[PDB]
Amino acid sequence: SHEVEKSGLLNMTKIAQGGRKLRKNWGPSWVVLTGNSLVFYREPPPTAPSSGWGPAGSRPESSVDLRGAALAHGRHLSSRRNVLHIRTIPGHEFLLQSDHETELRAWHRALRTVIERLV
Secondary structure (H helix, E strand, O other), rough: OOOOEEEEEEEEEEEHHHHHHHOOEEEEEEEEOOEEEEEEEEOOOOOOHHHHHOOOOOOOOOEEEOOOOOEOOOOOOOOOOEEEEEEEOOOOOEEEEEEHHHHHHHHHHHHHHHHHHOO
């Protein structure tokens, strides 16, 4: 469902788009996890960021379908300490990273839970 599972600021880079490799370009992203998607915003909501979406007129930069997505530690792809690699069925791949180990850990567990429930 579209109910929000988790939201938070993470550093993110695209690694591939439709199977085409991209050079890393790390930047901060306001991230929203639902029961079926990961949604990226350029900046966090102007207020009440724990709502995930913030105001309904706030437009995301991009979104991916998590059905059949795969998660792995991102150590082969980045030297950054706490990094996760997500690959999605249309061939979009990205890394998510945080300086805070506990935050990235929670995201890894949450993403896996959402993904498993979609099987």
